[PDB]
Amino acid sequence: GTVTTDGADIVIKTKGGLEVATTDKEFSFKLGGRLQADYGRFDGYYTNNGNTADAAYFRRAYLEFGGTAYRDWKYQINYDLSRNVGNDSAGYFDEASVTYTGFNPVNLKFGRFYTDFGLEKATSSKWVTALERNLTYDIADWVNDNVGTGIQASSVVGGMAFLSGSVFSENNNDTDGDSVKRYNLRGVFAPLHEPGNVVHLGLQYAYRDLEDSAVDTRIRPRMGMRGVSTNGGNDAGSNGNRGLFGGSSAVEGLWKDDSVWGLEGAWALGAFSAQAEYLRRTVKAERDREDLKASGYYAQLAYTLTGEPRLYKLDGAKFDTIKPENKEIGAWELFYRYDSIKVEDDNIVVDSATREVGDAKGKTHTLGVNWYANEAVKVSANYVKAKTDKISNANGDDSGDGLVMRLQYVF
Amino acid sequence: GTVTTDGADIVIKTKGGLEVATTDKEFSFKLGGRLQADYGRFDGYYTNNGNTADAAYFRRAYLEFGGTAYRDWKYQINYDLSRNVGNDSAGYFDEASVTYTGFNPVNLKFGRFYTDFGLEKATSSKWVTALERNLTYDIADWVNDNVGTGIQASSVVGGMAFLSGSVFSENNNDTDGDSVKRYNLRGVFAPLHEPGNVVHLGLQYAYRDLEDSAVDTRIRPRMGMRGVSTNGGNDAGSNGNRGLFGGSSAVEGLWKDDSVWGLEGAWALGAFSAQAEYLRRTVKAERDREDLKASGYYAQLAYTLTGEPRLYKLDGAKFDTIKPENKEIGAWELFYRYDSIKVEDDNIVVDSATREVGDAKGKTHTLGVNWYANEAVKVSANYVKAKTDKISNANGDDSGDGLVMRLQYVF
Amino acid sequence: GTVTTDGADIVIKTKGGLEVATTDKEFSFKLGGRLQADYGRFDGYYTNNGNTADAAYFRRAYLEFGGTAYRDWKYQINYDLSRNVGNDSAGYFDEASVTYTGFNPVNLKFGRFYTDFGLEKATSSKWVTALERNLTYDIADWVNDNVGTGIQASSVVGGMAFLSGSVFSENNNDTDGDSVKRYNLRGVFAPLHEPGNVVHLGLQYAYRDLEDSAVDTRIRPRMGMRGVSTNGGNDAGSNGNRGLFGGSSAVEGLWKDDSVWGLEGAWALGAFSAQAEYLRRTVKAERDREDLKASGYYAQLAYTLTGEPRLYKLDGAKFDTIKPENKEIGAWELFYRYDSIKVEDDNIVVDSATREVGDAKGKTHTLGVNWYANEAVKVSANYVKAKTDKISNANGDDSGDGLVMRLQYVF
Ligand SMILES: CCCCCCCCOCCOCCOCCOCCO
Ligand SMILES: CCCCCCCCOCCOCCOCCOCCO
Ligand SMILES: CCCCCCCCOCCOCCOCCOCCO
Ligand SMILES: CCCCCCCCOCCOCCOCCOCCO
Ligand SMILES: [Ca+2]
Ligand SMILES: [Ca+2]
Ligand SMILES: [Ca+2]
Ligand SMILES: [Cl-]
């Protein structure tokens, strides 16, 4: 039989998922998703006793529902079946947003989404080069999380720049049950913004007033290995070392406010790219207590051996996918990332078996390969070496090694 | 390329979601949903200390899958990603049902669905005029909840009336682990049943035998502000006052049975509509205990400034959507609702800090505006004023104010 | 309007769900699901006091997403909304897998799937003849569960046989946080493998090293009645007897290893089929403790009164659906299953109120009828009679009776 429509002409597409769209741009629907299956093995600092643990789990398992109605109104609902983002009271959302669009070039986004701070975070988790995002997000995780609901405005400006800003109602309350309000700004100058020709300078700022609020400020980096503690399958369990670098449990009235500044750069030329982000955080303490300070950076270099550039999008100021040219071979990509963090918490005044008085430091070397078999499937492996200072596992190790592999299917 | 089918002719449709159906009425599939993002601020009675709290949350985030097979067999599975209906044992279902239509005009529905009691409850939550349903459902929660599994028969009768009835296995057990069985009946005479031309008179009854059964009978109305306590994001937390009007926790053998009678009326002429429901509840006590009695009503006036009538459907005896006439400006609707409830629990014999001996009373005034931007998008604001008698917050407040806004997207 | 595509020609299908596929076999998407609504009533051994309990619940409520990309890469994501498989840490997955078929006839499967042990488990839960799978799986539930992540290879061999093997990272850890590794093998010789013409002989083996691991080894068969303890609705709650036949809670260091051997057969002559499985399990104990041993079998006879054979698939070595010949009548099927299990746990050295020293035994007789209304809808009733030895409920009953009905809708 035939397949017709009552309304405007429709075009349908499938690469394993589904797209249906009217040709007049008025209405559309997209059903997609991503599955990331990880297996990692790790030892030393990463585990409590320093022996090898493992983790087999889905890093992400999203079902993704998006569409357009009446040209200017869009929605996106991405739900994480692996339970690695969200919780069972707010919901396991990667995203639940509505966007208008009508004030083009200015876009207005409402709902649950990650606030815009950082190039690596802006980049789709399908296409982040490394298997895990950088260490600096571990020391300031509120700046670009989606743990709340808000409103964002964004615009490409003068065809060479991108600006975003939001107010976000966090799921942290003050003593009156009034939510902590988070403010974000991000501005990117990107005078070259094509795949294989990117020059990117970004500045970003986040602020929240913490007065009379109960907020968890414990900084507990996994140090580049997800499997020390993760949902989606299994992890190192009771032998996983997720060490406390500094900060406190959610006790009301410990802090005044929390501020983060970030500077970022990226340069892409053909198959080569370099990117780096630096951030500085200060949590101002209340009455007699000491401030919590944290800073860090990462630098990443990447090279597609098969020649294809990483996609770049000025709208969002973010990298994206690699589309393989050779349909049999696929695309092959090598990368290296260096990460370095420092946490200052002078509230820590006595030594322990795992924490020495002074600044906790962490650094990682990540070396990896991505095989893009095609636009649906990506197979990856990362070697990670961690080194810490003034923090260790219970065994006294200040270094650890890990190897993680991932099978990714997107539709 | 071409798009064809190997069965009967298919028609496809998208307005943000997806519909695929054979033109012989034999098979169909519909994927849709609804996202309701709320932000509320509220004080006085609504909070424990009387100060202003807020709540940013999804009221609902449904993914909706429905279809038809072999003409006469329908299914509908609606899942709440916002976690506001259901739980993590029974499932977060808005609906999971199978309908057989072969005995048309009689329909048979099986599974998890809300039992049919009340016009406002029968009305789709997409199209309920106010941001929250009326206070009388707070005093008789069980009469129209979906907290169980059952069988329902319903029919339009003589083109002028609607009847439904169900037996429902509640998720409440007696001492033998046998489920409380819930019985529902509803009958509506609607001699006029078209948009802008409605005369609706309804009677409804609900009964359950509670002998040796553990059932939560606590009546804890939110008093017209969802944000005092809700899933889907954040709420007033430890400062949210959800006051106990009466009733008891789930203990086996406190009660003999539970009966509810309801009367309802609705009238529409063009863009104006009025609707009202009254209910009376008695829970018969065992032993030397006193009965639990509750009664209440609401009345709602609504008017579409732009002239469009509310849709009305005789099948279900329910109001429905407003379709905007003007594609540029959309439709604008004003409404007022008055709610009034009374709870009599003579088991309460001593005063407490928030509850006086005697009948607890609550009334609200709700004033609101809906902008239907188009058939996908509705933006709303409600102002709510509450007044209680013999119940207060910890601050001794018996009045509260709230302002709540919603962005809704349906597909 | 028209419906077109910009890639290869597409065929779309709906029977309540959706399929979309390119005619060159390169890309496809399939959205489907299954809803199984059960109502059971049961007494005697099945309940703690021997009185009648009930259970109204969804046995399964899967949404099913599957597809193909670039010909050789397949995914399948099945999520259980009824909460009866998986958990809220690993996810409620029936399946989350990627299959590479490039090495055809050898298929490679990655992710979360049931390990391949047993004909009745290989059979889709849509088409399992009885409402609940056999008792032998209750005594060795790890051999074919999906509580972990792994890799499986499988192949039809020489047009007359099927072989599968896997390694599976279990969600059980040793003291180092290294997962218990499960190994499976299954081989089936099926020289006749067509509907109504089946001769099936299979051998299967499962092994896991449990050294220094914490694993729940409690054997707690429901004895043929799901309703004693289930998610998806309601169950017998505090009056549900799920008796402990033997084994221990997850204490690290109790066991050395766990081995299961299985033998199976199936025979089909037109509308008649017979199938049986036998298994034996030994959990070797550490240090001064006694081994846990379990063994059992089931035998099932099935006959389609209306004449249609059960489908059989050599790829997977499994039975499948019945496709009704009479559009009006549908298909009618009768079956009888006998199940018999024995659990030997010599660590039990003193009598209790519910358990006598010696081998715990259980046997069931299941008699049932299936009405396949059409290919989407199946209505079922099973009568179950249980008999136990050396184990009872608190009332002292060693026999129980149950009647369960199901409405199933598949799309
Ligand atoms: C101190 C300011 C805090 C404000 C935080 C608000 C976060 C709540 O976001 C929920 C979104 O719902 C808002 C509803 O308004 C929709 C308006 O849409 C109009 C589009 O043209
Ligand atoms: C000796 C009489 C025992 C029977 C007492 C039960 C009377 C009440 O019956 C209510 C049955 O509830 C039906 C619930 O079924 C819901 C599941 O729907 C799926 C149908 O297979
Ligand atoms: C192709 C990328 C790998 C990621 C796929 C996710 C599946 C994770 O499963 C973990 C595999 O565990 C197997 C480890 O077992 C160790 C012994 O292996 C012996 C195999 O004969
Ligand atoms: C034609 C197909 C070949 C079938 C061979 C399969 C044989 C394995 O079946 C497993 C069932 O074993 C049951 C053994 O239990 C013994 C029954 O004792 C009853 C004595 O009266
Ligand atoms: Ca029950
Ligand atoms: Ca709040
Ligand atoms: Ca592990
Ligand atoms: Cl879910």
DSSP string, C50-96: SS-EEEEEEEEEEEEEEEEETTTEEEEEEEETT--SSBTTTB-EEEE
- The Cα–Cα gap between A57 and C147 comes to 11
Residues forming beta bridges with residue B285, ordered by sequence position: B255
Give the distance, in angstroms, between the CA of residue C338 and the centroid of all CA atoms in the same chain: 17
Q: Do A409 and C98 touch (CB under 8 A)?
A: yes
**Separation between Cα atoms, residue A94 and residue A112, nearest integer Å:** 8
Assign B156 to helix, strand or coil.
strand
DSSP 8-state symbol, B45:
G
B188's tokens? 């509506």
Dist. CA C225 → ligand 3 center (Å): 36
Task: Classify residue B328 as exposed, middle or buried by CB count within 10 Å of its CB (0-12, 13-18, 19+).
Answer: exposed
The CA A89 to ligand 2 mean position distance, Å, reads 32
Q: Taking CA C21 as the corner, what is the angle to CA C17 and CA C25, rounded to the nearest 5 degrees? A: 140
Question: Is B9 buried (19+), middle (13-18) or exposed (0-12) by CB count in 10 A?
Answer: middle
Alpha-carbon span C401 to C385, nearest angstrom: 5
Ligand nearest to the CA of A102: 1
Query: How crowded is residue C93: how many other Cβ atoms within 10 Å of its Cβ?
Result: 27
CA distance B3 to C142: 45
Pairing of strands A318-319, C93-100: unpaired
Domain boundaries, given as residue ranges, for chain A: 1-411
Strand intervals (E) in C227-269: 255-269
CA distances (Å), B43 to each of A174, A178, B396, B402, in order?
Answer: 14, 10, 12, 7
Contact C72, C100 (CB under 8 A): yes
How many Cβ atoms from other residues are within 10 Å of residue A276's Cβ? 19
Scanning the structure block, which residue is given the tokens 């064809």? Answer: B4
- The CB density around residue C175, as the number of other CB atoms within 10 Å, is 17
Instruction: Count Cβ atoms within 10 A of the Cβ of residue A341 and give its class: 0-12 exposed, 13-18 middle, 19 or more buried.
Output: buried
Residues of C in contact with A12 (CB under 8 A): 3-5, 10, 12, 20
For residue A395, give the DSSP letter.
T
Do residues A83 and A57 make contact, with C-beta atoms less than 8 angstroms apart? no
Cα separation of A344 and A291, whole Å?
Answer: 8
Contact B54 A2 (CB under 8 A): no
What one-character DSSP code corresponds to residue B122?
A: H
Q: What amino acid is encoded at B48 in this protein?
A: N
What is the CA A394 to chain-centroid distance, rounded?
29
Q: Which residues contact A138 (CB under 8 A, 6 or more apart)?
A: A219, A220, A221, A222, A341
Best mutation target among C176, C211, C251, C252 (most A Cβ atoms within 10 Å) is: C176
Helix, strand, coil distribution of chain C in percent, nearest 5: 5, 55, 40
Gyration radius from chain C CA atoms = 22
Residue B135 has φ and ψ, to the nearest 5°, of -65, -25
Superfamily name and number for C1-411: Porin (2.40.160.10)
| Residue linked to tokens 């949902």 | A231
Q: Is C279 helix (H, G, I), strand (E, B) or coil?
A: strand
Distance of alpha carbon A169 from alpha carbon A181, whole angstroms: 5
Residue of the CA atom closest to atom 6 of ligand 2: B181
Residues present in chain A in total: 411
What is the residue type of A222?
A: R
Q: What tokens appear for B49 in the block?
A: 């200390």
**Cβ contact A90–B234 (<8 Å):** yes
Pairing of strands B53-69, B28-42: antiparallel
* Alpha-carbon dihedral sign for residues B36, B39, B45, B47: positive
Residues of C in contact with A55 (CB under 8 A): 179
What single letter denotes the amino acid at residue B134?
A: N
Coil, strand or helix at B221: coil
- Asked if the Cβ–Cβ distance from B110 to C407 is below 8 Å, we say yes
Amino acid B353 reads: A
DSSP B292-360: EEEEEEEEEEEEETT-PPPPEETTTTEE-----S-TTT-EEEEEEEEEEEEEEETT--S--SSB-SS-E
Chain B environment of C237 (Cβ under 8 Å)? 173, 177
Q: Round the CA-based radius of gyration of chain A to a whole number and report it.
A: 22
Contact check, Cβ <8 Å, B10/A1: yes
Q: If you measure from the C-alpha of residue C342 to the centroid of ligand 4, how many angstroms do you get, rounded to a whole number?
A: 16
* Resolution value in angstroms: 1.9
Query: What residues in B contact C5, CB-CB < 8 Å?
Result: 1-3
**What is the enclosing helix (H) or strand (E) of A293?**
strand A292-304
Helix, strand, or coil (residue A36): strand
- The sign one gets for the Cα dihedral A386, A391, A392, A398 is positive
Gap between the Cα atoms of C407 and C411, Å rounded: 14
- Do B131 and B407 form a contact (C-beta atoms < 8 A)? no
Q: How many C-beta atoms surround the C-beta of residue A369 within 10 A?
A: 15
Question: Max alpha carbon distance in chain C (Å)?
Answer: 78
Nearest CA to ligand 1 atom 7: A150
Interface test with B, best of A25, A77, A108, A115 (most B CBs within 10 A): A77
User: CA-to-CA distance for B143 and B166, rounded, in angstroms?
Assistant: 11
CA angle B382–B387–B391, rounded 5-degree value: 130
**Quick one: which of A380, B5, B112 has its CA closest to C37?**
B112
Its sign, for the CA torsion B229, B231, B235, B237, is positive
CA B173, B174, B178, B183 dihedral sign is negative
CA of C214 to the centre of ligand 3 (A): 21
Query: Which residues does chain A have within 8 Å of residue C65's beta carbon, measured at their own beta carbons?
Result: 33, 63
Q: Which residues in chain C are closer than 8 Å to A52, comparing Cβ atoms?
A: 176, 178
Nearest residue to C266 via CA among C367, C162, C376, C340: C162
Non-local (6+) Cβ contacts of A280 within 8 A are A260, A261, A262, A293, A294, A295
Whose CA is closest to C127, among C135, C137, C119?
C119
Contact flag C67-A411 (C-beta cutoff 8 Å)? yes
Within 10 Å of residue B288's Cβ, how many Cβ atoms? 6
Q: How far apart are CA C153 and CA C148, in angstroms?
A: 16
Q: Are C32 and C411 in contact (CB under 8 A)?
A: yes
The secondary structure of A136-186 as a DSSP string is GGGGSGGGG--SEEEEEEEEEETTTEEEEEEEEEEEEEBTTSPEEEEEEEE
Nearest to B35 among A75, A88, A175 (CB): A75
Q: Is C191 exposed, middle or buried (0-12, 13-18, 19+ CB in 10 A)?
A: exposed
Report the alpha-carbon distance of residue A20 to residue A4 in Å, rounded: 13
Structural contact between residues A383 and A403, judged by C-beta atoms closer than 8 angstroms: yes
**Residue A381 identity:** A
How far is B326 from B321, CA to CA, in rounded Å? 15
Q: Which helix (H) or strand (E) holds A2?
A: none
Which chain B residues are Cβ-neighbours of C9 within 8 angstroms? 1-4
Mutation target among B88, B167, B178, B211 for the C interface, most CBs of C within 10 A: B178
Token pair listed for C63: 């949404």
Question: What are residue A107's DSSP bridge partners?
Answer: A154
Cis peptide before A105 (omega within 30 of 0): yes
Retrieve residue A194's tokens.
């094509």
Neighbours of chain C (3+ CB pairs under 8 A): A, B
At B228 the three-state DSSP class reads helix
Please tell me the total number of residues recorded for chain C in this structure: 411
The residues, any chain, with a CB within 8 Å of residue A173's CB and separated by 6 or more, are A179, A180, A213, A214, B53, B234, B236, B237, B238, B239
Tell me the CA–centroid distance for residue A231 and ligand 7, in Å: 11
Provide the phi-psi class of A135: left if phi over 0, else alpha when psi is between -120 and 50, else beta.
Answer: alpha
Distance, CA of C286 to chain centre: 30
C24 C-beta neighbours (distance < 10 Å), count: 11
Secondary structure (H, E, C), A204-248: EEEEEECCCECCCCCECCCCCCHHHCCCCECCCHHHECCCCCECC
Closest Cβ opposite residue B69 in set C61, C240, C411: C411
What backbone phi and psi angles, to 5 degrees, belong to B3?
Answer: -130, 120
CA B42, B47, B52, B54 dihedral sign is: negative
Ligand nearest to the backbone CA of A62: 8
Residue C357's contacts (CB-CB under 8 Å, 6 or more residues apart) are: C348, C349, C350, C351, C390
Secondary structure class of B136 (helix, strand, coil): helix
Residue of B12, B37, B240 lying closest to A10 (CB–CB) = B12
Secondary structure (3-state) at B239: helix
By residue count, chain B amounts to 411
For residue A276, the one-letter residue type is: A
Distance CA A156, CA C393 (A): 70
Out of C4, C63, C234, closest to residue B169 by CB: C234
Q: Which ligand is nearest to the CA of B409?
A: 1
Whether residue A354 has its Cβ less than 6 Å from ligand 1: no
Work out whether the CA dihedral B214, B220, B224, B228 comes out positive or negative.
Answer: negative
Q: Do residues A247 and A217 lie in contact, with contact meaning Cβ atoms separated by under 8 Å?
A: yes
- Of A322, A132, A375, A315, the closest CA to residue A230 belongs to A132
CA dist., res. B186 & res. B154, Å (int): 9
Tell me how crowded residue A267 is: count the other CB atoms within 10 A of its CB: 16
Say if strands A179-194 and A161-173 run parallel, antiparallel, or are unpaired: antiparallel
Nearest CA to ligand 1 atom 15: B407
Which technique was the structure solved with, according to the deposited record? Answer: X-ray
The answer for residues whose C-beta is within 8 angstroms of residue A391's C-beta and 6 or more apart is A243, A244, A245, A354, A355, A356, A360, A361, A362, A398
Half-sphere exposure of A318 (CA within 13 A, CB side): 20
φ, ψ for residue B141, nearest 5 deg? -55, -35
Q: Show the beta-strand stretches assigned E in A43-122.
A: 53-69, 73-80, 93-100, 107-112
Q: How far is CA A87 from the centre of its chain?
A: 17
DSSP one-letter code for B177: S
**Is the C-alpha dihedral spanning B209, B215, B218, B221 positive or negative?**
negative
What SS3 class is residue B139?
Answer: coil
Distance CA C188, CA C200 (A): 7
Task: Supply B154's token pair.
Answer: 């319903």
Output the CA–CA distances (angstroms, integers) from residue A299 to A119, A387, B81, B259, in the order listed.
12, 16, 37, 69
CA neighbor of C293 nearest in space, from C252, C261, C249: C261
CA distances from A118 to A105, A108, A121, A201, C282 (A): 22, 19, 5, 11, 55
> Nearest-CA distance from A56 to chain C in Å?
6
Cα four-point dihedral sign A120, A126, A127, A131? positive
CA distances B322 to B33, B306, B325, B376, C63, Å, are 18, 11, 9, 11, 31
Inter-chain CB proximity B14 and A1 less than 8 Å: no
Structure tokens at C394: 């608190």
Cβ separation of A6 and C10 shorter than 8 Å?
no
> Which residue, among B48, B234, B242, would best test binding to A if mutated, counting the most A CBs under 10 Å from its CB?
B234
Pair B21, B381: CB distance under 8 Å: no
Q: How far apart are CA B232 and CA C297, in angstroms?
A: 48
Are A336 and A365 contacting, i.e. CB atoms less than 8 angstroms apart?
Answer: yes
Q: Evaluate whether B275 touches B265 at the Cβ level (below 8 Å).
A: yes
- In angstroms, what is the span from residue C263 Cα to ligand 4's centroid? 8
Among protein residues, the one whose CA lies closest to atom 6 of ligand 4: C265
**Cis amide bond preceding C105, omega within 30:** yes
Output the six-digit token pair for C116. 């391949």
Are A178 and B52 a contacting pair at CB < 8 A?
Answer: yes
Residue C22 in tokens: 């390119």
| Count of beta carbons in the 10 Å neighbourhood of residue C95 | 21
Could you tell me the distance, in angstroms and rounded to a whole number, from the CA of residue C37 to the centre of ligand 7?
35
Identify how many contiguous H helices and E strands chain C contains and give both numbers.
1, 21
Pocket of ligand 2 (CB under 6 A): B 110, 149-151, 167, 169, 181; C 37, 39, 56, 405-407
Task: Write out the H or E segment, with its range, that includes residue A355.
Answer: none
Segment holding B119, helix H or strand E: helix B119-122
DSSP-derived 3-state class of residue B240: strand
Alpha-carbon distance C342 to C364, whole Å? 12
Contact A347, A367 (CB under 8 A): no
How many helices (H) does chain A have, and how many strands (E)?
A: 1, 21
- Is residue B268 within 8 A of residue B302, CB to CB? The reply is no
Residues of B in contact with A22 (CB under 8 A): 14
DSSP lists the bridge partners of residue A240 as A47
Q: Which tokens sit at A146?
A: 């989606």
Residue that has been written with the tokens 């709290």 in this structure? B53
CB-based burial, C246-265: b 16+ in 10 Å, e otherwise: bbbeeebebbbbbbbebebb
Instruction: Using alpha carbons, list the distances in angstroms from residue B227 to B57, B205, C58.
Output: 8, 30, 31
Phi, psi of C237 (to 5 degrees): 55, -125
B253 Cβ neighbours under 8 A, 6+ residues apart: B175, B212, B213, B286
Residue A67: which residues within 8 A CB-CB, separation 6 or more? Answer: A27, A28, A29, A30, A74, A75, B14, B16, B17, B411
Residue that has been written with the tokens 């996994």 in this structure: A222
Structure tokens at A388: 């810490």
